[PDB]
Symmetry: C3
Amino acid sequence: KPRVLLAASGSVAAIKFGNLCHCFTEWAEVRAVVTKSSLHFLDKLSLPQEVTLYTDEDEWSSWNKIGDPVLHIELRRWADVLVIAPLSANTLGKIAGGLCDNLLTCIIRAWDYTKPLFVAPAMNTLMWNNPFTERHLLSLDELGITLIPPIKNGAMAEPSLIYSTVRLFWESQ
Amino acid sequence: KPRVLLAASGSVAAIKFGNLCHCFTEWAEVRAVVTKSSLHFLDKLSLPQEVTLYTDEDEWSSWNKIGDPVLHIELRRWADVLVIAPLSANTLGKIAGGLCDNLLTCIIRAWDYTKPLFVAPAMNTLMWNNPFTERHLLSLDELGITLIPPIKNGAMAEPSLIYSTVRLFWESQ
Amino acid sequence: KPRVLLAASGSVAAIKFGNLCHCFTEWAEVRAVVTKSSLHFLDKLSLPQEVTLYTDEDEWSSWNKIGDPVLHIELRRWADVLVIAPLSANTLGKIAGGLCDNLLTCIIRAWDYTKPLFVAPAMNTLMWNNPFTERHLLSLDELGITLIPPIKNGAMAEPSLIYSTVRLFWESQ
Ligand SMILES: Cc1cc2nc3c(=O)[nH]c(=O)nc-3n(C[C@H](O)[C@H](O)[C@H](O)COP(=O)(O)O)c2cc1C
Ligand SMILES: Cc1cc2nc3c(=O)[nH]c(=O)nc-3n(C[C@H](O)[C@H](O)[C@H](O)COP(=O)(O)O)c2cc1C
Ligand SMILES: Cc1cc2nc3c(=O)[nH]c(=O)nc-3n(C[C@H](O)[C@H](O)[C@H](O)COP(=O)(O)O)c2cc1C
């Protein structure tokens, strides 16, 4: 059973993150990662009971002294695939900038692109049409990241599409 | 009467932001946006009484649940022009990076460059002469942003120049 | 006696920062700069008693009103050389992005590359092998920064090597 890491960043579409997790739970073992901002839009009670939710604070529950496991490193090794849905314009920019100041971006900055990484951008039309969207998505493409396009613009792809896109890929490999 | 959005970021020159707003109030309808760091140098009592000042917290006064208006989107649509004076080296870098973690940078990341956007950089000479200044300003130029050059170096352009530069442009269009 | 600014950013290797300072104290006048995250791994009591340690808060102890000295500017002028050991992946990215949101990155964003700046990256192997490492280090190289390579991968270079590398350079100039 594939290990799928699902992540949410600060887009209003994170309100659908619980449902997205539900779409993956039967087929895969699911763990969730959220940014602080995503918590403004996500209700934890909407998530499957079996899914462990990790936040920035969890980095310090795992590590306390030298030698201990570093959570972003353990999740990166554990995952067969990472799906960021929603991917906010800010996190999109931080990924393109190679920055890492929280659990999600640390996992990504430690990423080995031999492993599949999918993103479902979700942002207002004005940010979607702004020039940095095409610039950063182009950079993510070069890295090997797979874009699950928003719905026409910038609204997050539907959970069912995110799920079937990842499932079809896995079964083909 | 043109709608002018005036913004201040974390430079000591933000102490002059109130006066800058005063220069624009008769000619335009003015709204102000400040970053958290700019508040170290700006005195709110120096602003025109008629000017509404928006901060990061205001994003949450406008939005509470799905469907509500998102402040950075409403200000971006409302504005005929955006003027950032002072523009700090940090915000300059975030703009060039397509990042958005506060009200000001969210407005900019949602910007449609068909609308004029002027910047008045303000930083110590050492930061002004540092290589990233020319690199980021070059990127802003390509986007279509209009630079109001600092005074010789890196001291913010005088409010009167910022004002006449924006006014002359508007009247020509 | 050369003025050496030693800095630590958020890597576990910062636990060795006190010892690194000790390596430099006899030969140079040493001042230390730390990021907030580095404080998770550094024990202040491990530092030489004679070394003043500066943090982000110190920026506000030095400056209170217009005209006062700005600490990152004073340290940049004071230093003959800057050594960042450890350099985290995040600070590496912020340097390459020309960003400055804390004392360390403000000093760097104000840097005049005629003065030597050495970096000793320290990060988990997964981050070291990630594509942004080579990309950002390449950018730092172009600026004139001198890389003191990690030990095979990504573990920080030993303090003795960091010290002799800086000392040999100085004595040659
Ligand atoms: C009410 C509101 C709704 C937002 N909606 C979105 C959105 O749909 N997509 C997006 O990319 N950013 C959106 N933003 C801006 C992000 O929340 C902001 O850039 C944030 O810093 C991103 O944090 P993160 O990327 O670390 O999760 C919104 C902001 C607010 C206040
Ligand atoms: C006392 C002091 C004065 C500063 N003056 C300036 C300045 O004139 N210009 C600048 O670009 N940054 C200056 N900085 C650094 C910025 O305040 C810092 O990069 C900040 O993170 C920028 O925040 P913002 O861009 O989100 O407003 C100063 C810092 C301090 C502590
Ligand atoms: C327990 C733990 C250990 C970490 N070890 C490292 C490390 O060795 N190198 C690194 O580059 N980042 C490491 N990180 C991630 C950084 O601490 C993180 O990117 C941080 O935001 C960097 O802050 P700074 O660059 O402003 O100091 C670690 C994180 C945690 C929670």
